[PDB]
Design a protein around this nucleic acid. Structure first.
Ligand SMILES: NCc1c[nH]c2nc(N)[nH]c(=O)c12
Ligand SMILES: [Mg+2]
Lengths: 182, 79, 51, 51, 221, 313, 219
RNA sequence: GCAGAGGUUCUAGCUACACCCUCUAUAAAAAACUAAGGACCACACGA
């Protein structure tokens, strides 16, 4: 491993593996947080550091739900098989606040919101933040052009873009949805 | 608060009839300015009406008599 | 071709844990010991996407 | 949450009544083997905590 | 009637220590043990990070060049950071380490009021000599568990869930006391597995107080 | 379009989607009474939003209805207090996804809960035939005074103790409370506290909490059982009966009317169903509801204290 | 950081002088159970009382053997003897035994209250005597002791009933204050023998626990 | 909208069921009033 980073991993291949011409390094650009087909997160986490001898076929970086090259769907958690005050009545499950405190089962969810400017009648929709009759706090999160700044925490009902009905059409966070704009 | 209506069904045998008689009294209590005869223990009008039936303060016959008396009072107001 | 119960008993015996697999447990709230020692161990747990 | 004699609180408490009817007796075996594995891990950790 | 004392407070290890309450009568010892364990696990003053501002990243869900772990991984590591503060309630700690080698709590700039219990604890790994990391971590005292969403300005500041509880695992053992003059007396030994930020005897005394003022309500005015 | 499930008459006329309605997963929450249930705070604000707007206008906190709409979006403390008033006596219908029988929809008094999941009282879970394997219940809010009175009079769970199909209690305890009672109402040949004489069931409970006597040790304790032989009059009878400590403790839960013989058995599932049926037959429905709720509470508590556990050994 | 919501006793409903249902609205999350559990054990097993059930056998070789001429069984009399509350005597030791009896149910009144015996319930019946001439059993429970002590650990031997509270139940429900995370609300139901009022018993239990925590008050 | 005209605002605001105000040629002093286009088919999942 010549160089390792959360974004990318550089392996310097052994000379025997190396082809005679134009060879000697293998660069793997790890995919960072990306929107999954089921709205989860595909995160590629490196599991090796500098100088670690990596053999052919070895796993350089764990994928989502992957731990040191082993599939890790969930968390091995402490289980007590007892009926506790009826909280676990039919098949219900108690969980300690310790689990939430340690973020044991917390999961990142990626939701992709698309606002489309269209060639409407009486002029096209305007993506620029020309929208009137809006709160100043909502405009503050938006940039000059109306697009929300990267990494700005937003809450359901907050404006994210600046689409204007040709003379209020701007996309807003769906209610109950919150979080940074990756 | 009445969480059980069994005493009210004793007062009105049909039980389905108890919903109808209580509804008329409750409507009188809410839409109309009618004082709750039963003391209001932080109760909504529907519960007060059920309590009045359980008390026996209000029954289908009693509600009819009160409505007839109000009609007579309206004639007295007309003078 | 997985482990038989005897192998699990031996593995428990390797640790300080009782071979029976039942560990005496105490209520968090009252602080009174439960009768009939309960089963405690780590089982893999999955959160499902039906949040 | 309930705690054993060592004081470690159990994170998840499950109804044991699902085991008899829904005959997934493996989860009990799974729990026992997980306890044995964590006992091994705890002895290793105790050896590692000290020198 | 007899009243207990912390006759012995032994620090078997930095993380966890055992506290003994010898003059306890029958029945009283078990009650005090259970109540003390619950009050200690539930609500004790503690110090934990609550807001982190990495200079080079905008949001937690991103990577920084030259850092092996993710920014969110950095926040997860920093959440369980052993910090004690005395004096002012909130303090901002600055970390600036450059070059290769994993950064540690020792790398953080040392201030007079705050001393790190566990400098050896690892935050992230700097895998590039050229790359460097700069951050300002804000630590305040609180109780119990405070989710990040519950708390609360610019996009740079990252909110991290705060776990103010200094005690991790607590157990009390009730055994017969060694006193010979009066039998049936049972000493109480309480072991507290803590992050190290809280003093054992001080934590026990503080929990006893909190119980007392909560108990003072029951007695009539 | 005219015919079939796709067809409008089946598609809409027969079944019309309704306003003031919502779905969420189910949660136990045993602490609730049988008549009441658990309702999410956020869900209630959306479900009762017109009632909230009206109450705000009557209070005068909102001068106009547009202001009331803004206040609901703000979710200020005043809006939550208004929600508590509307939630206090507006019954909410709770409907299981497959409504095979009338019991599938039962109204309940809504109680605000921090969690985002509807809580259904455990005894009525068996009536719904629902489980907690991520089952989802549609929740509807009756509006009119006729609707609310209809809900409280008939729809409410307390009214439907017995299943319409058979004159038997459909709120029969199902899983955990029955196990806890069976552990409680059990006999051991030898256990600590065996052979003692106890003043009353209160003394049995005090001994059990002290730990001097176990739940399932047999003792000679007097029981004051009231007999309904006189129609409408309770005749007290006190006698020394050889029973377990646990059965003595459960006797406090039982009302005065019922005889002590019913508790003196093992009290399994058919036994507890017969107990509930006898309670309904002899005493009123309201005493039966209180008895069922107390049964559930005591069973859960003593099952948790029992520490029942399944193991390979 | 040391400021926790302090419970206020919103209601102290007394269904009977013996039965009370004190409730505190605020408390703290997971504190209602802690205070409730601590209070329950302290009054149940550590609150002292002056009822020594064990008394001198009269006219019976064995406690199990039943004396003739009295309708009640000897065990039934023993259960009644445990029931008599007997207010705390100034002298800690048991000093009073009176067996005076009359035909029909013989109440606690005949034994009387010599010195500080102060029997709580004269009405309570010790036993039923079939024969007017026969005078037997009765006697008085006057030794101070803490909690319930069984006959096996402690003439005629009866399990002691020193504990003032016959039964106590602590129940916790989640009640938020204004707009806040729900906090434990604890209601304690206490039935006392009658030596002290249930509210007074709660006060006595609180002081007893406070004395244990007195050393660690952080000055 | 007293009829015609204009209207604070809290999108738009004599009809959508609407509603109110002031004013006399044309806009400007003021508070109380009210719910939006979603069709079909496949796949998958959860009950
Ligand atoms: N819909 C009528 C209308 C438009 N603008 C208004 N301004 C005011 N003050 N009052 C109203 O009634 C109206
Ligand atoms: Mg189901």
């Amino acid at each position: 491993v010549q160089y390792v980073d959360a974004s990318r991993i550089v392996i310097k291949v052994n000379e025997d593996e190396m082809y005679p011409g134009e060879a000697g390094i293998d660069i793997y650009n790890l995919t960072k947080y990306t929107r999954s087909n089921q709205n989860t997160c595909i995160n590629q986490m490196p599991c090796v550091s500098l100088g670690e001898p990596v053999e052919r076929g070895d796993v350089l970086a764990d994928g989502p739900s992957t731990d040191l090259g082993e599939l890790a769907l969930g968390q091995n958690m402490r289980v007590a098989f007892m009926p506790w005050n009826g909280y676990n009545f039919e098949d219900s499950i108690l969980v300690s606040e310790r689990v939430v405190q340690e973020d044991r089962f917390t999961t990142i969810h990626i939701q992709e919101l698309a606002c489309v400017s269209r060639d409407t009648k009486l002029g096209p929709e305007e993506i620029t933040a020309d929208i009137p009759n809006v709160g100043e706090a909502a405009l503050s999160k938006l940039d000059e052009s109306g697009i929300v700044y990267i990494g700005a925490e937003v809450t359901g009902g907050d404006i994210l873009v600046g689409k204007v009905t040709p003379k209020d059409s701007s996309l807003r966070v769906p209610n109950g949805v919150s979080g940074t704009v990756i | 608060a009445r969480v059980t209506v069994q005493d009210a069904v004793e007062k009105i045998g049909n039980r389905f009839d108890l919903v109808l008689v209580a509804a008329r009294r409750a409507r009188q209590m809410q839409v109309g300015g009618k004082d709750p005869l039963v003391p209001e223990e932080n109760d909504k009008t529907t519960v007060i009406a059920l309590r009045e039936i359980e008390e026996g303060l209000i029954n289908n016959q009693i509600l009819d008599v009160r409505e007839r008396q109000e009609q007579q009072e309206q004639e007295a107001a007309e003078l | 071709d997985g482990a038989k119960e005897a192998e699990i008993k031996e593995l428990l015996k390797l640790g300080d844990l009782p071979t029976s697999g039942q560990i005496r447990l105490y209520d968090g709230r009252t602080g009174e010991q439960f009768e009939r020692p309960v089963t405690v161990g780590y089982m893999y747990m999955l959160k499902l996407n039906h949040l | 949450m309930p705690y054993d004699e060592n004081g470690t609180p159990v994170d998840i408490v499950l109804n044991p009544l699902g085991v008899p009817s829904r005959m997934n007796i493996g989860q009990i075996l799974e729990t026992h083997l997980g306890m044995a594995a964590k006992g091994i891990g705890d002895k290793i950790n105790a050896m590692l905590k000290q020198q | 009637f007899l009243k207990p004392r912390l006759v012995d407070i032994e620090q078997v290890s930095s993380t966890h220590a055992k506290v003994t309450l010898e003059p306890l009568e029958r029945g009283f010892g078990h009650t005090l043990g259970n109540a003390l364990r619950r009050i200690l696990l539930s609500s004790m003053p503690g110090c934990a990070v609550t807001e982190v501002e990495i200079d080079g990243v905008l949001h937690e869900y991103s990577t920084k060049e030259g850092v092996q772990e993710d920014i969110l991984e950095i926040l997860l590591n920093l959440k369980g950071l052993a910090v004690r503060v005395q004096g002012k309630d909130e303090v901002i700690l600055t970390l600036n380490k450059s070059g290769i080698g994993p950064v540690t709590a020792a790398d953080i700039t040392h201030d007079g009021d705050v001393e790190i219990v566990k400098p050896q604890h690892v935050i992230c790994h700097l895998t590039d000599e050229n790359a460097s990391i700069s951050m300002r971590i804000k630590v305040q005292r609180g109780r119990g568990y405070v989710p990040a969403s519950t708390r609360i300005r610019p996009i740079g500041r990252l909110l991290v869930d705060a776990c103010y509880s200094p005690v991790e695992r607590i157990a009390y053992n009730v055994e017969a006391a060694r006193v010979e003059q009066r039998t049936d007396l049972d000493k109480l030994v309480i072991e507290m597995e803590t992050n190290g930020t809280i003093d054992p005897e001080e934590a026990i005394r503080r929990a006893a107080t909190i119980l007392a003022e909560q108990l003072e309500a029951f007695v009539d005015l | 379009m005219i015919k079939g499930k796709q067809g409008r008459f089946r598609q809409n006329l027969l079944g019309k989607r309704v306003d003031y309605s919502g779905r969420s997963v189910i949660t136990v929450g045993p602490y609730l009474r049988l008549h009441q249930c658990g309702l999410p705070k956020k869900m209630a604000l959306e479900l009762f939003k017109p009632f909230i707007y009206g109450k705000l206008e009557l209070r005068g906190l909102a001068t106009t209805i547009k202001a009331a709409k803004k206040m609901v979006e703000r979710e200020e403390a005043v809006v939550w207090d208004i929600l508590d008033e509307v939630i206090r006596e507006h019954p909410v219908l709770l409907n299981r996804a497959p409504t095979l029988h009338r019991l599938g929809i039962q109204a309940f008094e809504p109680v605000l809960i921090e969690g985002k999941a509807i809580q259904l009282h455990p005894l009525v879970c068996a009536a719904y035939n629902a489980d907690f394997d991520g089952d989802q219940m549609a929740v509807h809010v009756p509006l009119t005074l006729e609707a609310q009175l209809e809900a409280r009079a008939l729809m409410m769970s307390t009214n439907n103790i017995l299943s319409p199909a058979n004159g038997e209690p459909i709120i029969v305890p199902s899983q955990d409370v029955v196990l806890g009672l069976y552990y409680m109402t059990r006999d051991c040949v030898n256990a600590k506290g065996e052979g003692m004489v106890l003043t009353g069931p209160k003394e049995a409970e005090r001994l059990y909490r002290s730990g001097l006597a176990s739940l399932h040790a047999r003792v000679k304790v007097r029981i004051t059982e009231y007999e309904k032989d006189a129609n409408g009059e309770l005749v007290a009878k006190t006698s020394l009966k050889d029973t377990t400590v646990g059965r003595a403790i459960l006797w406090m839960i039982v009302p005065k009317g019922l005889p002590y013989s019913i508790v003196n058995q093992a009290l399994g599932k058919k036994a507890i169903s017969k107990m509930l049926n006898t309670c309904y037959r002899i005493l009123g429905l309201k005493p039966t509801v209180i008895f069922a709720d107390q049964i559930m509470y005591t069973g859960f508590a003593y099952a948790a204290r029992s520490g029942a556990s399944v193991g390979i050994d």
